[PDB]
Short mmCIF file of C-alpha atoms and ligand atoms in Angstrom, two decimals:
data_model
loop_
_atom_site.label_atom_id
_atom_site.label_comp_id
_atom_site.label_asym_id
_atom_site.label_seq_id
_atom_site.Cartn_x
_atom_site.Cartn_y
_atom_site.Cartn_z
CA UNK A 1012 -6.39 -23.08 20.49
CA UNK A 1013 -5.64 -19.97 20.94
CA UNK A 1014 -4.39 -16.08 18.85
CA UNK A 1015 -1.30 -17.16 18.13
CA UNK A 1016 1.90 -14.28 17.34
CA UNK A 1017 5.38 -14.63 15.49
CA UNK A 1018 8.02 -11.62 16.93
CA UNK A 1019 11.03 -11.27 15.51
CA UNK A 1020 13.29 -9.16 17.75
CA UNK A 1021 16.62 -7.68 16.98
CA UNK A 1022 18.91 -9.59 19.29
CA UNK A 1023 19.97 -8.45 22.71
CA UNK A 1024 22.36 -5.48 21.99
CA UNK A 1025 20.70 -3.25 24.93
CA UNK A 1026 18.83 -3.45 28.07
CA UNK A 1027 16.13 -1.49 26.71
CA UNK A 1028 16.15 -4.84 24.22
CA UNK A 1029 16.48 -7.37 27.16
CA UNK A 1030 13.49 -5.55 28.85
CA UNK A 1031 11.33 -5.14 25.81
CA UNK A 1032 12.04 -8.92 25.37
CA UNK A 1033 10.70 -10.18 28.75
CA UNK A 1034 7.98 -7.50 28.13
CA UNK A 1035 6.50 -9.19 25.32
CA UNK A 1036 7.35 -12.48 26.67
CA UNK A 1037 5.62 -12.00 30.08
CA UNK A 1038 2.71 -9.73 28.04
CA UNK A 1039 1.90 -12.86 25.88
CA UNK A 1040 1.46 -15.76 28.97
CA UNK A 1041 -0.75 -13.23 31.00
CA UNK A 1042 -3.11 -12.21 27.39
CA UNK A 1043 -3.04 -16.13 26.53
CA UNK A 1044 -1.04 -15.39 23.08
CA UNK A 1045 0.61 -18.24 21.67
CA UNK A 1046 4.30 -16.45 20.95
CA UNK A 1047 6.54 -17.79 18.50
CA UNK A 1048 9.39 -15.93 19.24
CA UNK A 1049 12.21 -15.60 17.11
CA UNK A 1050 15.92 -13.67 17.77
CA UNK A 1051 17.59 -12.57 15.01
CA UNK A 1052 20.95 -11.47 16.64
CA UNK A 1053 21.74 -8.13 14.87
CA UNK A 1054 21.21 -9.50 11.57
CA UNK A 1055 18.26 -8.73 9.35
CA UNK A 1056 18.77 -12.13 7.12
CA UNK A 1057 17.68 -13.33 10.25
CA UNK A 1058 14.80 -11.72 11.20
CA UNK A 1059 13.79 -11.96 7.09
CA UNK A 1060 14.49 -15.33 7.12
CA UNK A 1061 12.22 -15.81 10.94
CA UNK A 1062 9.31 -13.68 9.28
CA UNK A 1063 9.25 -16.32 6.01
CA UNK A 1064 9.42 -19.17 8.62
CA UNK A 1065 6.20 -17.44 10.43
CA UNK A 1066 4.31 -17.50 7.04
CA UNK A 1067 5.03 -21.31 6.95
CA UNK A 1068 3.82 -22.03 10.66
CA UNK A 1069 0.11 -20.32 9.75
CA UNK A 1070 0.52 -18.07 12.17
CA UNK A 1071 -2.42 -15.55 12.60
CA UNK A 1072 0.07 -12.26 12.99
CA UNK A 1073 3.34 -11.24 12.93
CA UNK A 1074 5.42 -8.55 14.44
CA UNK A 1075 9.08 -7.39 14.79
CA UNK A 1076 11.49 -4.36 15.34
CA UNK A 1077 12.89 -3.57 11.72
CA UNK A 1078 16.63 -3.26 12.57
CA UNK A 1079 17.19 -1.09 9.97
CA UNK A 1080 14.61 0.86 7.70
CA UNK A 1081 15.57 -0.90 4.07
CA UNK A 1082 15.04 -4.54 2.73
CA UNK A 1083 11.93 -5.52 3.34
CA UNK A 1084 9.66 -5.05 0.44
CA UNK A 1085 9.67 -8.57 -0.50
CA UNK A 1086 9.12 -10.01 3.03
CA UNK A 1087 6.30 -7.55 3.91
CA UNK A 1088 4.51 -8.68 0.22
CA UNK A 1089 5.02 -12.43 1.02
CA UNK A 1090 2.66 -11.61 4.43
CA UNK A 1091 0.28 -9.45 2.65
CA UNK A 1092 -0.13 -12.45 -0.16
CA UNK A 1093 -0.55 -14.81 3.23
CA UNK A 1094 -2.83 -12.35 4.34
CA UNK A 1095 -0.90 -12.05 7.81
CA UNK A 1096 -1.19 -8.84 9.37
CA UNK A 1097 2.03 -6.63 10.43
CA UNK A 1098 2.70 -4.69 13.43
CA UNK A 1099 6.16 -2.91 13.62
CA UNK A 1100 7.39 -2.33 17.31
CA UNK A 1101 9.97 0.48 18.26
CA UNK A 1102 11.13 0.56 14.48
CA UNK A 1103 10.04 1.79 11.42
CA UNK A 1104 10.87 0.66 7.78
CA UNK A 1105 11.23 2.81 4.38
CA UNK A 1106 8.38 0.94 2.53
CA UNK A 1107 7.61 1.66 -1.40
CA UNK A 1108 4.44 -0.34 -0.96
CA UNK A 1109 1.00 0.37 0.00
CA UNK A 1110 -0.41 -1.17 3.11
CA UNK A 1111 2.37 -3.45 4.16
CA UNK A 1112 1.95 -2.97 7.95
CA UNK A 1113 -1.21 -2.23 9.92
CA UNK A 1114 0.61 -0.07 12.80
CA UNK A 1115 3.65 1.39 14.33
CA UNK A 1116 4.22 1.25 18.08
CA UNK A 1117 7.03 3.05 19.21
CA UNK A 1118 8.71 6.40 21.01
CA UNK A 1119 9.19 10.35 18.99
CA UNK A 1120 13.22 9.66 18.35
CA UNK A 1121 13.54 13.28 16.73
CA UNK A 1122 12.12 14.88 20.32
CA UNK A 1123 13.88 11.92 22.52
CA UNK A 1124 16.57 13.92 20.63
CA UNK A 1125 15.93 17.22 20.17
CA UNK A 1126 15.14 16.82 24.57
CA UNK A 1127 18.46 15.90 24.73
CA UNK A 1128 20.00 18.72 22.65
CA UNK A 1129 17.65 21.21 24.20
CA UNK A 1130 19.22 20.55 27.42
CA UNK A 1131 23.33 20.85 26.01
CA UNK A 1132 21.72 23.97 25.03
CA UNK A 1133 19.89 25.23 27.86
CA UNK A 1134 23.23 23.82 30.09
CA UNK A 1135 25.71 26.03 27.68
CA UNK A 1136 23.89 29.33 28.02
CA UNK A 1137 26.36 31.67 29.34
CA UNK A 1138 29.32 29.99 27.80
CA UNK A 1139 31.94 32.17 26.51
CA UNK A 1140 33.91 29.77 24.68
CA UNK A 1141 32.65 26.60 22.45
CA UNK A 1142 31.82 23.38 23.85
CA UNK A 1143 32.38 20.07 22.25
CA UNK A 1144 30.50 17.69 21.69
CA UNK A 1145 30.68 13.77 21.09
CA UNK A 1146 28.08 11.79 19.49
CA UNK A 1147 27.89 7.60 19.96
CA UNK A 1148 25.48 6.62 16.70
CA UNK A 1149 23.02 3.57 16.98
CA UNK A 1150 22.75 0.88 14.98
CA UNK A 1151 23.80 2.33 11.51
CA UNK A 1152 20.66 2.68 9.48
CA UNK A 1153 17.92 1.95 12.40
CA UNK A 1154 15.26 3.92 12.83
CA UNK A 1155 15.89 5.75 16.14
CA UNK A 1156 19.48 6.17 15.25
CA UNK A 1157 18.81 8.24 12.35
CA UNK A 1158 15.86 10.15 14.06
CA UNK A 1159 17.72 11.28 17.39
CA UNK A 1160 21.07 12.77 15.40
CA UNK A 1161 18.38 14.41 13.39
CA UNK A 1162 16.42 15.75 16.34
CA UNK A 1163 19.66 16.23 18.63
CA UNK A 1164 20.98 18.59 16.01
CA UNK A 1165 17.93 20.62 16.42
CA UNK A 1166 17.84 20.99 19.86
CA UNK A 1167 22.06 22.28 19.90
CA UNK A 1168 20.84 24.11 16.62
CA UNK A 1169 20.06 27.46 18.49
CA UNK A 1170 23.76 27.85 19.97
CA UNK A 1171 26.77 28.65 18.28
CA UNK A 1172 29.11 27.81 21.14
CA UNK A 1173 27.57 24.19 20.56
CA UNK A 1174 29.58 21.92 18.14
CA UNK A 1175 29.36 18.14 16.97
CA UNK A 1176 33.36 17.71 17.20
CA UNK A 1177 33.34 14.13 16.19
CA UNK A 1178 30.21 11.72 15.71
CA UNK A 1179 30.46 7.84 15.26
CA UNK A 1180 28.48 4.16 15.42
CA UNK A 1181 28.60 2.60 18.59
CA UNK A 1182 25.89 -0.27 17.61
CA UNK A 1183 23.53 0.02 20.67
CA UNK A 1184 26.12 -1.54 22.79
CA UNK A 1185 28.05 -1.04 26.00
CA UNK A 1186 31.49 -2.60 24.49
CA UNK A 1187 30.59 -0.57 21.25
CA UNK A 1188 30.23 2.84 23.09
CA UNK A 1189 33.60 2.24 25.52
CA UNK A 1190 35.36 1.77 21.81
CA UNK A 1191 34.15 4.93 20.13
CA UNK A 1192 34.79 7.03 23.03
CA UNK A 1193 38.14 5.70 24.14
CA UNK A 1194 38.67 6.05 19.92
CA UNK A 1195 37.47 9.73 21.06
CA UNK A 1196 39.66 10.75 24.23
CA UNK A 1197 42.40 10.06 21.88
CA UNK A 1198 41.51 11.92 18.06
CA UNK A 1199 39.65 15.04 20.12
CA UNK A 1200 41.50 16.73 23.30
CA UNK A 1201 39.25 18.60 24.72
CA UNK A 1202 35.37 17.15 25.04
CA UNK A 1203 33.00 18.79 27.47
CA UNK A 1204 29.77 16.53 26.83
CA UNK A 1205 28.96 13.45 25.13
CA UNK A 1206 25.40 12.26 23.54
CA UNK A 1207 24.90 8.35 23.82
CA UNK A 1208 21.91 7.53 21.77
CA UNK A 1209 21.49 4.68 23.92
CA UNK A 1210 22.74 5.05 27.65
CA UNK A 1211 24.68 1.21 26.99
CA UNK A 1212 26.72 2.86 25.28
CA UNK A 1213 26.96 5.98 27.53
CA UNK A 1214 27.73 3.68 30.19
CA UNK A 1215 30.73 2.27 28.11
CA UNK A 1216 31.88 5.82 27.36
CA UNK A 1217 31.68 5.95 31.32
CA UNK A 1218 33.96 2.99 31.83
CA UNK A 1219 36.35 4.95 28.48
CA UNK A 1220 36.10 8.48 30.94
CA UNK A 1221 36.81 6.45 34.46
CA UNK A 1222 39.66 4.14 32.60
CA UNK A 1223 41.72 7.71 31.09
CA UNK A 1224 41.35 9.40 34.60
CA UNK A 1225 38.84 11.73 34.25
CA UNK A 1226 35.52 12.10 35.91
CA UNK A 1227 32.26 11.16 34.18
CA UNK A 1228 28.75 13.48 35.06
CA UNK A 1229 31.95 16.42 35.99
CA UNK A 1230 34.85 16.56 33.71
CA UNK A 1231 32.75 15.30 30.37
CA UNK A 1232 29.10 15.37 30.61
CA UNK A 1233 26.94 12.49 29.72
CA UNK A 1234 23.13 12.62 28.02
CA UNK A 1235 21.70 9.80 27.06
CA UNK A 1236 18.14 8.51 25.41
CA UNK A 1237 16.92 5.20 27.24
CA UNK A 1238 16.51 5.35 31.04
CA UNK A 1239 17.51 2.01 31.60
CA UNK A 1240 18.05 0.50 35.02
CA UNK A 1241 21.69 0.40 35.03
CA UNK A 1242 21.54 4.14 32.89
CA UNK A 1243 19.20 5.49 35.87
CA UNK A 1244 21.67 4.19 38.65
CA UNK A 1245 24.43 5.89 37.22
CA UNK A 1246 22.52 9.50 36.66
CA UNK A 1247 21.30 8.90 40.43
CA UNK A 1248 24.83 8.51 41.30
CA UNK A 1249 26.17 11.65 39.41
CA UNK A 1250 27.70 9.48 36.58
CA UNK A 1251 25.41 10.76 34.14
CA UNK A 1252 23.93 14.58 33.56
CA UNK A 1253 20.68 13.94 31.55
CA UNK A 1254 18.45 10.78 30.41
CA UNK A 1255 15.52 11.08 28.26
CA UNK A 1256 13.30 7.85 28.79
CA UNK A 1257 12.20 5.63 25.94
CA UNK A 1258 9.74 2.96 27.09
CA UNK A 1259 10.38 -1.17 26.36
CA UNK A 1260 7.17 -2.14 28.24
CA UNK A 1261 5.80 -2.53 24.86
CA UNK A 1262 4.12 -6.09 25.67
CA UNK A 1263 1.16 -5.71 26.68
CA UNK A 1264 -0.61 -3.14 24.13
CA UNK A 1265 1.62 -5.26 21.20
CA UNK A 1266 -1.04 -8.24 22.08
CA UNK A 1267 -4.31 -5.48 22.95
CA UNK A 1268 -3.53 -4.42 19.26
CA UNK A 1269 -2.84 -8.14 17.87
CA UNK A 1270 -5.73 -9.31 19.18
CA UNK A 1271 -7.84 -6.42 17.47
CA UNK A 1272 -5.93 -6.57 14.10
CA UNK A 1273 -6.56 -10.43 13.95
CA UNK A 1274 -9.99 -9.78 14.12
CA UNK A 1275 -9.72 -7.16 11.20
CA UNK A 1276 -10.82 -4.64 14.25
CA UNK A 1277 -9.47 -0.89 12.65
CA UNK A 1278 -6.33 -0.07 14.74
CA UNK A 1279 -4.54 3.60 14.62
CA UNK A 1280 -1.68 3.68 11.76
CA UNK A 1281 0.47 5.33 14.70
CA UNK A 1282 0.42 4.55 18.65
CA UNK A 1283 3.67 6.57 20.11
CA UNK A 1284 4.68 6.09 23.38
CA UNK A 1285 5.39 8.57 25.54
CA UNK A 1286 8.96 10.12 27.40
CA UNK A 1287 10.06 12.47 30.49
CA UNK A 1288 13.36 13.18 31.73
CA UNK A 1289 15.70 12.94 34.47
CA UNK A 1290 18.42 14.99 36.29
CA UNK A 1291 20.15 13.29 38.81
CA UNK A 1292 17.86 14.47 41.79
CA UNK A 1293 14.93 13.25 39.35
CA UNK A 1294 16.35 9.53 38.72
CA UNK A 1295 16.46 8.86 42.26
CA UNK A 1296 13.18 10.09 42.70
CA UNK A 1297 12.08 7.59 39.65
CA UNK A 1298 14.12 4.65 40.68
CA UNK A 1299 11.59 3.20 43.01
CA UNK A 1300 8.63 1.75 42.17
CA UNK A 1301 9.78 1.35 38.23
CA UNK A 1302 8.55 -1.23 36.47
CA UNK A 1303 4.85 0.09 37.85
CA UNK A 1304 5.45 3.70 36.57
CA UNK A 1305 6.82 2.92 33.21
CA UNK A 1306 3.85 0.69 32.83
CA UNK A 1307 1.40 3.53 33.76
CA UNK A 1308 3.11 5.98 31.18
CA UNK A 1309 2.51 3.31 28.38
CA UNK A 1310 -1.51 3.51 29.33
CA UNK A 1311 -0.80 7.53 28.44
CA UNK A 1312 0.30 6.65 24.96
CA UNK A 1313 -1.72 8.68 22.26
CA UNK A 1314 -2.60 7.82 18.22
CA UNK A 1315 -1.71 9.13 15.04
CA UNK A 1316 -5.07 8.74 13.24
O1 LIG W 904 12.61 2.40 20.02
C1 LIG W 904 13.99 2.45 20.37
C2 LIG W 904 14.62 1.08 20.20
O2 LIG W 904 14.26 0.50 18.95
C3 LIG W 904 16.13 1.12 20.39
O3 LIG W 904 16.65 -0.23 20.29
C4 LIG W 904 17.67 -0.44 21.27
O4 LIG W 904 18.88 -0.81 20.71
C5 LIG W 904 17.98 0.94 21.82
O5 LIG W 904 18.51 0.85 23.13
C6 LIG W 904 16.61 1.59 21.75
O6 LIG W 904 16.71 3.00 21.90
ZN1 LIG W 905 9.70 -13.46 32.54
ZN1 LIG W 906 7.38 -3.82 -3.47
ZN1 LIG W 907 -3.32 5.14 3.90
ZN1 LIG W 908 11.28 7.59 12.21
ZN1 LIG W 909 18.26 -4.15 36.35
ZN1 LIG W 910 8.30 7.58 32.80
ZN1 LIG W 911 -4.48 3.49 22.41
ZN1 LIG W 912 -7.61 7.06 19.29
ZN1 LIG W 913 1.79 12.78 18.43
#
């Protein structure tokens, strides 16, 4: 007898998703949270259709990561009619309603990339011819996908030499991202960097480089936004250039905040969590200890009041 939570997650696309998963798993035995969790697998009939089963269970609140920003007006008016609070995790939606959600909990995708490009940028300085880039897309129409081409752009913005050659959607996978770039060694000849969105599918594009002969962190240039385990190894081994770190230890401050919500406590509309980045000499550095320091830069997270 007990708070009890409905999350809907995405699927298991990444390992930023497959960590963010256990995270709220593990978060919920150690708070005492009843979870009902619910895995939509890449679909967002299926995460709709897991909300509208949480309204029928009477569950006290409900939370999920909108896959993509559009369709759910009608979903987030059947919980405010239930009177079930909403807590979006590391997406956001395009709402035309008026308190639908009570907070958003997730990472600054436009500076994750506009980092990113800053460092293309600051990399390409006394280049005398242009440099091409690649760009592997997330998820078409989520959140972060959307916000890091916007904010990457930015950053390469303030250099001509810089120049989006070819840009495409790689879903947030590792099979996706070895597509789109071997689909890229062939349509574009010469490529001196590529931006993953997502270092899965950076680290596919690093199997695409490896597989046509060339050599990835040297010949092309990888940046990616994540710092997953398997992204960090690869930076720390010289595989990657550049990985700006979004946080999935979301877990534990998803039940602090359900927990206060349920109790019609006043939470901040916005709770962003925060980033750093990583050369190579930096990821092995970071590699240690992880799983303590990413949750110690979640406890530096700051509101949007
Ligand atoms: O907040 C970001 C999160 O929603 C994204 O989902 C995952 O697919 C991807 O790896 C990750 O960047
Ligand atoms: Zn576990
Ligand atoms: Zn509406
Ligand atoms: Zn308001
Ligand atoms: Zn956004
Ligand atoms: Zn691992
Ligand atoms: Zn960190
Ligand atoms: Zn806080
Ligand atoms: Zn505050
Ligand atoms: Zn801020």
């Amino acid at each position: 007898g007990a708070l009890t939570l409905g999350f809907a997650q995405v699927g298991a696309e990444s390992g930023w998703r497959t960590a963010n998963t256990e995270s709220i798993k593990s978060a919920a035995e150690e708070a005492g949270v009843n979870l009902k969790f619910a895995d939509a697998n890449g679909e967002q009939e299926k995460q709709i259709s897991a909300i509208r089963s949480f309204i029928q269970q009477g569950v006290d609140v409900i939370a999920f990561s909108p896959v993509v920003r559009t369709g759910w007006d009608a979903v987030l008016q059947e919980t405010k009619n239930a009177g079930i609070p909403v807590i979006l995790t590391d997406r956001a939606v395009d709402t035309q309603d008026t308190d639908v959600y009570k907070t958003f909990i997730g990472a600054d995708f436009i500076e994750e990339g506009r980092r990113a490009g800053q460092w293309v940028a600051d990399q390409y300085a006394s280049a005398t011819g242009p440099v091409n880039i690649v760009q592997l897309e997330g998820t078409t129409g989520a959140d972060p996908a959307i916000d890091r081409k916007t904010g990457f752009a930015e950053g390469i913005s303030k250099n001509p030499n810089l120049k989006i050659v070819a840009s495409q959607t790689g879903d947030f996978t590792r099979s996706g991202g070895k597509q789109v770039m071997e689909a890229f060694l062939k349509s574009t000849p010469q490529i001196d960097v590529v931006f993953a969105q997502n270092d899965d599918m950076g680290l596919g594009a690093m199997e695409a480089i490896e597989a046509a002969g060339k050599k990835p962190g040297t010949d092309i240039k990888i940046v990616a936004v994540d710092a997953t385990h398997d992204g960090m190894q690869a930076l720390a081994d010289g595989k990657f250039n550049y990985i700006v770190e979004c946080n999935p230890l979301l877990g534990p401050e998803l039940m602090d905040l359900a927990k206060k919500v349920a109790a019609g406590e006043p939470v901040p509309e916005r709770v962003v969590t925060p980033d750093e980045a990583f050369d190579q000499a930096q990821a092995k550095a970071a590699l240690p200890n992880r799983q303590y320091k990413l949750a110690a830069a979640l406890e530096h997270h700051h509101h949007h009041h």
